[PDB]
């Protein structure tokens, strides 16, 4: 029935790397420190 496409994507933080699109939550480089913090934890698990 519509005269335009009725599906609208939303994005958290949107932009171009330069040639193509890129988008992210808040979580993009959060994963770097989180898995790191777990590594140090789990290494000491062996010692326990």
């Amino acid at each position: 029935a519509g005269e335009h496409i009725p599906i609208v994507p939303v994005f958290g933080e949107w932009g171009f790397v330069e040639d193509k699109e890129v988008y992210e939550g808040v979580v993009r480089l959060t994963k770097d420190g989180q898995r790191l913090r777990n590594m140090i934890m789990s290494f000491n698990a062996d010692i326990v």
């Binding site: 140090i40 934890m41 000491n44 698990a45 010692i47 326990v48």
Partner: protein
């Protein structure tokens, strides 16, 4: 001469610090109130 007792490993102690820190992160919901909403809105809105 005197008997040196286990003081509890610093490894075990440092692991216990990461143990107590693991639980209290997810306890917070963004809540800052003594009643519904106040940054816990996500849980209350899906109920209604």
């Amino acid at each position: 001469a005197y008997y040196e007792n286990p003081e509890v490993p610093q490894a075990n102690a440092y692991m216990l610090e990461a143990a107590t820190s693991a639980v209290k992160e997810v306890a917070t919901l963004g809540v800052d109130t003594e009643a519904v909403n106040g940054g816990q809105v996500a849980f209350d809105t899906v109920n209604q």
